[PDB]
Design a protein around this nucleic acid. Sequence first.
DNA 1: GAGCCCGTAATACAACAGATTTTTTCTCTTAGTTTTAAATTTTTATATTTCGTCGA
DNA 2: GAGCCCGTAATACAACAAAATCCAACAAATA
DNA 3: TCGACGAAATATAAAAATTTAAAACTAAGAGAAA
DNA 4: TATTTGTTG
DNA 5: GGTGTTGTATTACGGGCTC
DNA 6: GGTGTTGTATTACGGGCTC
Length: 418
Amino acid sequence: SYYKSDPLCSAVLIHMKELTQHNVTPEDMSAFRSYQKKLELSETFRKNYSLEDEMIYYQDRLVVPIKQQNAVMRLYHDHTLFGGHFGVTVTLAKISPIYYWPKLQHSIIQYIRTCVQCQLIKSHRPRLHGLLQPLPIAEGRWLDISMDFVTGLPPTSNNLNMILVVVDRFSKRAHFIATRKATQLIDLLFRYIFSYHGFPRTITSDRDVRMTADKYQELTKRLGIKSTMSSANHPQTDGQSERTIQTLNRLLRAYASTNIQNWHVYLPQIEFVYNSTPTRTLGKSPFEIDLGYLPNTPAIKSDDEVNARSFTAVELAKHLKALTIQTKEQLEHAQIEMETNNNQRRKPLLLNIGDHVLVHRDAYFKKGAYMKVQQIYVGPFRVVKKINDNAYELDLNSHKKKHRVINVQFLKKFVYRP
DNA sequence: GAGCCCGTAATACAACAGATTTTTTCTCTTAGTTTTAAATTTTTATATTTCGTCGA
DNA sequence: GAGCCCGTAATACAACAAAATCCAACAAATA
DNA sequence: TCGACGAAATATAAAAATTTAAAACTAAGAGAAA
DNA sequence: TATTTGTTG
DNA sequence: GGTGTTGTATTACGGGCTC
DNA sequence: GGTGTTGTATTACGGGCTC
């Protein structure tokens, strides 16, 4: 039960094979590509096709007619003759030692994008699927605020359990919100610690139940506060707070190495140390990014001046304007530097309407659902809206899934074939 | 240089790195409880609505 | 080219990516 | 085809006196999701 | 001799 | 509307000397 | 004695044409 026991006088290679035969030319519809290929063969000298008793082949490899292309690549890709659904390299190593197939690599990668199980099972670095495209930089001071918290720490005396952080996107000002892992009184403690400065414009946070929080969201809609609400298991958007708790974790380890179970005393020292230390992407201390009144003043900084903003009373407007201008251009510099050092391999994905994208078992099933060697056979979903440049909402075929926003790091767009 | 086709063929990039239950609120869904007010009678004069009928 | 000192100063590279239970099973420690 | 009347339906304020929902109010039970 | 308790894929 | 982001050793580029 | 390692899209380099 072997193949190639069939003559085909109507295919692309007929023009190539009549270079010796010159007998019959029964071309088909859309066979004008064969005419152009024969013209290119005529103006060049690459004649290596061998014609031996109906076996027309290349120098050592069997050229296959285009009628049975899919049959051959399915035979050497599926388990009919022990393929195994591998990549283009193993498929070439199975086919190219035996067959030639002009533009074989493009045909094989097209088949990889065609075969459904390879789309659902393979990953092929599904963490580089969209550009960086960071947050818009800022406005006037204390208008954008980043919100997140680490769920659990070694508990203190039974009054405090975990640390919440507030750092603004502009100035990156540390904060010490020590919660109890909380209730609807989140707005009480949160209000007491941001309203020390004032009400922001948008909150960059995750889809956490203390902030998804239909009771708390309506408060923000009434008050005039937006909510970015980073999607399920995509904590990258929170950013400044995540980077702060990275710096806080080192600081908390430093100040509580031998002093576990009472770190709530040292937490204001943690935030004050974070506040007094200059950063890199802005080059100035977060006091200086705000009203520059580093109160410790161990020594005067470089370019010695008055450096006493307490003496200035009415002229603070020009000083804050100057700080705002230089910090805004520094934020733009940080944005472009991040975009340069990150997008060296980040391939974009821009669809925005009418596709059948997937979600490869991350933010689709539960974060608490165990990942194992169980098959990854998420069905072909649909996309109806372009919610952002780096995400697309889906019509999750479930009860509700409680969210339908999927960042591009889980999509891996499905492609059909007739 | 300058590009193009195509055919091979190198090429850095990332996955294998014990896996699962909890922890703390929240938010639909769906079955059980509780307090309370309401379906047909007398009735009494008042008035207006809407049928219902009758008359020349 | 050719290298060196020194003084700044850019520069990719990785950490924040929820936290903490055991599962199964080796061998030490008493009583 | 305009006039002429009869008559149930309500409120009404009590005392009452058996059945019927019936919608707030709890309380599992799943499903999220840092 | 059963119930522990260090560490490790 | 809504989607990364800085801390850190490490390393690259100008004044001043030998040319 | 004892300590990474390949699968995979992706991309870079020679024959043959225009020069």
